[PDB]
Amino acid sequence: MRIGILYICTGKYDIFWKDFYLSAERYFMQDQSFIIEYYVFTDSPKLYDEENNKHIHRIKQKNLGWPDNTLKRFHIFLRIKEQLERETDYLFFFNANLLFTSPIGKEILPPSDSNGLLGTMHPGFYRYYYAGGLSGGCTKAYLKLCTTICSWVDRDATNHIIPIWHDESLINKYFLDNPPAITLSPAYLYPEGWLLPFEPIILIRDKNKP
Ligand SMILES: [Ca+2]
Ligand SMILES: [Cl-]
C-alpha cells in the first residue's frame, strides 16, 4: 500500500521538516511493504534530504498568512489531487511541528469497507471534539473531505474578508456529518508539557530542541 503524507511548511515552519521526516522514516509504517510518499507544500527552495530521496515531493506553495495558511489547507492539497489519486492509496495530514516517537502501523488504516476516514481527538477535550493537526483516510475518501471543506470555505472567500470558518470548526462539521471510521486518541496529538494519562505516540513539539 502507498501511503501519502501531506505536510505544509511555508515560511519559518520549514524548520520543522527535518525532524518530522527523520522520525517518520524511523517510526511511521515501518513494514517495508508500505511505500511512503511525502508531499511537502513549501516556499522553501530546498528541503532536507530532497536531493537523496525522491519519495520527497516538494510542491511549490506561496506563504499565505492568517487566515489563509490553515484556512486554505485543503485547497492546497487539491491542486495536486490528480497526482494524489494516481500515486497513493491513503493520505494523512500532519501539522508541521508533529514528531513520531514510537511505531505506527496498519492499525491507523481505515478498512476498505468503512467510510475510509480518520480523525483525531483534541487533547484539550480528553461525538468527539476533533483537532485539525491530524486527519486522513483512504485517498478517495480524504479527497472528498478536502473537496467538501473547500466548497464551504469558497462560499465566503470572496465576500467575507473576516472568515467565519476555521480549519478546526470545518473538520468538526465534516466529521459530524461523516463520523470517521477511525478516531485516534490524543496520544496521537500529545502536546509536549501537558499532563495526560496515556503515553505520547505522536508529540506536538514545543519550542525547545533537546
Ligand atoms: Ca521540546
Ligand atoms: Cl518506509
- Cross-strand bridge partners of residue 3: 36, 90
Residue 86 neighbours by CB under 8 Å, 6+ apart: none
- Residues with CB under 5 Å of ion ligand 1 are 206, 208
Domain residue limits, the chain: 1-210
The CATH class that applies to domain 1-210 reads alpha beta
Among the bound ligands, name the one nearest to the CA of residue 205. 1
Rounded Cα–Cα distance for residues 192 and 121 (Å): 16
Contact 117, 178 (CB under 8 A): yes
How many A from CA of 29 to the centre of ligand 1? 24
Rounded Cα–Cα distance for residues 137 and 74 (Å): 14
Experimental method: X-ray
- Cross-strand bridge partners of residue 130: 121
Contact 142, 116 (CB under 8 A): yes
- What percent helix, strand, coil does the chain show, rounded to 5? 35, 25, 40
Among the bound ligands, name the one nearest to the CA of residue 35. 2
Among the bound ligands, name the one nearest to the CA of residue 27. 2
Contact 85, 131 (CB under 8 A): no
CA-to-CA dists, residue 195 to 124, 126, 210, angstroms: 10, 11, 19
Among the bound ligands, name the one nearest to the CA of residue 55. 2
Contact 119, 184 (CB under 8 A): yes
How many A from CA of 34 to the centre of ligand 2? 6
> For residue 99, which phi and psi values (nearest 5 degrees)?
-145, 125
How many A from CA of 201 to the centre of ligand 2? 18
